[PDB]
């Protein structure tokens, strides 16, 4: 019966080959590059005792949550560098933080296997654990809010799950990966999401149904970060094989690879700009790179970190990009 | 310059900074450890005994606090993870040490233990992280060598030509064969450690029984050495 699977895989490969006529490079060749982009440090957010893994902006584009392995979530006022909140976590080994679109909640997860959801707006003045989501048999690598009541978690166990925050049960359990899922990016419309795992593969999922709608395989190693192009029909990845890749949901292929011979470290965070003309990637070579998505040339370098960039985030209106490194600092670049 | 409200906001930030400084003081004084070992490896006994004499169904990491000579130690053993390691091991690149507990009485799973040790030692993120390897279950190894039913040269052919090193220290007085066997195991692990050290981190062998009460002191002494080496590097002494 395995021969049937091999034949079907060959058929899918042939269909993808047939649907390919031109590459993004040829078609974009008649469009001018962004040129040299100089982005400067505007604010440095100090205060984390250990290294920073995760950082998620608020939809108000001013507030900002960050996670450190010292066991602390800090909410920042990016305009004034103030500390709005400091949430002591129950497990120090956090590797993901999320900020609710409404701004009422923040979530975190890590080696504890729980996604903890925090209530930022209470009658009392403190922030408290709204509830703890349990059920994963592996570390939670990413968590994203759909609304105040639904959250999507990705785990070291191949499962990505969908939870109802009211009474916390895995409403839909997404399975099909073979390795540890690392990144998780919701579509702008919150009906699909992409997962990048250690099987060097990415999958688009349908949240309402629970089925792997598409499966992308183009990488030579494990996949570390993922993000949607603002349009909702393309996404970009980062892998430890020192490359980024841009896949199109409708074309079901790879469009352009962002690589250079000099760089040999892995990408740890990928974030697009507001228009997608700039693709920002965080690396292990102490520095962050800014790429032109249409011409695949290094447009800029964001180099001010003394350790590896572990998180990277671009605000909803595109004014600033935040990057946090293993040196316990966030930098707000404009 | 800035309104009543911003001033108050700034005050809040300053109070938060004060609590964080306190957290920094507590964090710096506490040394973190990662406990690694197999299923047959007796790390469960070591963690239980250290919890006893010193100081939730799919939970992934277990926190074990203990204190030796007024020094605080946090020891973590991963509970609910899969076989794969190459991702969550990156989180432990700032620990004081990695305690690697091995079952020395297996003789058949011990090549797998060597492979795991060579995976830990050569990890790109675990460079500059020393390893306190606990060669656990010495009594079982002693009784197994004395009984003579199961051999050791059969699984490791080089055991025949191996001779007992002159720096051996079998203290209580034990048969020469058990000393030879345990130092052969130790020498295999130390060969892996020495092959590609480059001097940025060390491996500290210890022969352990899971019931022994001296394991905390062993960890304390090794951690003292590790911190001494780091501070030597930091204060421009080498």
């Amino acid at each position: 019966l395995r021969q049937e699977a091999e034949q079907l895989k060959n058929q899918i490969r042939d269909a993808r080959k047939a649907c390919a006529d031109a590459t993004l490079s040829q078609i974009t060749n008649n469009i001018d590059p962004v040129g040299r982009i100089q982005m400067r440090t505007r604010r440095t957010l100090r205060g984390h005792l250990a290294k920073i893994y995760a950082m998620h902006w608020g939809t108000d584009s001013r507030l900002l949550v960050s996670a450190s392995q010292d066991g602390k979530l800090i909410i920042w006022d990016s305009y004034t560098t103030n500390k709005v909140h400091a949430i002591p976590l129950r497990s120090s080994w956090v590797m993901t933080c999320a900020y609710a679109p409404s701004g009422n909640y923040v979530a975190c997860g890590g080696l504890d296997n729980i996604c903890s959801i925090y209530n930022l707006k209470t009658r009392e003045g403190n922030v408290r654990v709204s509830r703890e989501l349990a059920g994963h048999t592996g570390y939670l690598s990413c968590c994203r809010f759909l609304d105040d009541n639904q959250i999507v978690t990705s785990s070291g166990d191949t499962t990505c799950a969908l939870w109802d925050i009211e009474t916390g049960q895995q409403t839909t359990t997404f399975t099909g990966h073979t390795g540890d899922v690392m990144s998780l990016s919701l579509a702008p419309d919150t009906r699909l999401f992409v997962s990048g795992a250690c099987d060097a593969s990415a999958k688009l999922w349908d949240v309402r149904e629970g089925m792997c709608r598409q499966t992308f395989t183009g990488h030579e190693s494990d996949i570390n970060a993922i993000c949607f192009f603002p349009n909702g029909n393309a996404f970009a990845t980062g892998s430890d094989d020192a490359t980024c890749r841009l896949f199109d949901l409708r074309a079901d292929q790879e469009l352009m690879t962002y690589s250079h011979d000099n760089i040999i470290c892995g990408i740890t965070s990928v974030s697009f700009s507001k228009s997608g003309r700039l693709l920002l990637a965080g690396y292990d070579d102490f520095n962050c790179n800014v790429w032109d998505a249409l011409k695949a040339d290094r447009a800029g370098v964001l180099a001010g970190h003394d350790n590896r960039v572990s998180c990277l985030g671009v605000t909803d209106d595109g004014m600033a990009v935040a990057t946090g490194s293993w040196d316990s600092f966030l930098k707000i670049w404009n | 310059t800035l309104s009543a409200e911003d001033k108050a906001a700034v005050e809040r930030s300053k109070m938060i900074e004060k609590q964080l400084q306190k957290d920094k003081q507590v964090y710096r004084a506490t040394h973190r450890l990662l406990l690694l070992g197999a299923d047959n490896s007796g790390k469960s006994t070591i963690v239980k005994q250290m919890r006893i004499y010193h100081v939730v169904k799919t939970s992934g990491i277990f926190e074990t606090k203990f204190q030796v000579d007024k020094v605080n130690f946090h020891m973590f053993d991963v509970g609910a993870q899969r076989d794969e390691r190459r991702k969550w091991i990156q989180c432990f690149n700032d620990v004081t040490a990695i305690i690697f507990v091995v079952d020395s009485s297996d003789y058949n799973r011990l090549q797998e233990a060597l492979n795991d040790f060579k995976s830990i030692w050569n990890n790109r993120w675990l460079r500059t992280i020393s390893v306190i390897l606990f060669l656990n279950k010495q009594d079982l190894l002693a009784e197994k060598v004395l009984a003579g039913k199961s051999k050791i040269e059969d699984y490791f052919p080089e055991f025949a030509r191996y001779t007992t090193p002159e720096d051996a220290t079998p203290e209580p007085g034990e048969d020469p064969r058990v000393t030879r066997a345990k130092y052969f195991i130790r020498d295999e692990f130390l060969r892996i450690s020495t092959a590609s050290g480059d001097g940025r981190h060390y491996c500290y062998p210890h022969f352990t029984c899971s019931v022994d009460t001296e394991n905390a002191r062993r960890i304390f002494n090794d951690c003292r050495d590790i911190i001494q080496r780091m501070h030597l590097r930091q204060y421009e002494l080498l």
Partner: single-chain antibody
Amino acid sequence: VQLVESGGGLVQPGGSRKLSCSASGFAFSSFGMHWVRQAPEKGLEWVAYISSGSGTIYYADTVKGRFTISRDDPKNTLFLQMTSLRSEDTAMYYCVRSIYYYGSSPFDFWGQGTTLTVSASADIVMTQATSSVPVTPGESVSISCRSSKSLLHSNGNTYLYWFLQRPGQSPQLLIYRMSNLASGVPDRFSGSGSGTAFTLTISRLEAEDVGVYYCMQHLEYPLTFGAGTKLE
């Protein structure tokens, strides 16, 4: 959350008293606290404010030296050391809770009040419109306020606050920073203005919407209030 305050009574002129405000149901240590008094038939006046961490203590000019404010965060009680009680010190003193960060809602909870009866310059003035607006239920009203100095700041925040006071219990917050409806306020209430002239609108009144409407500025100390507007 609740703020219960006590320690008041008939006091002879020139005497002293220590007003205490017991707080429970919220994280006291992270809140700043205000003392607001109102004369027996007049509007509200600010007495003092103590910050979280006690690093900022402000007093009104009228009580600049006689009064002293303190807090006991462990024991969770707010104190007011009053000395040399003159005859303008006959009022009901209110305990108010204020927290300050981006997006915060100051002056949200007001304590019940202590009654204290005594036997026989460059400050911002806030002026209400006629202190009587008789309106039938189901209509819409547009209570107005005027400020001497433009409450808008370079931040982009205009610091106008709207409070409602039933004929009975302590005031409750309705609008903070000029356009934001407090936790629990119905969507009928809406606030607007242009920096100096302000308006609060209630879209469709009810029988429970009656009381006296006070404004407040938080642009700079001291906190001045205004006379208040009565609805009947």
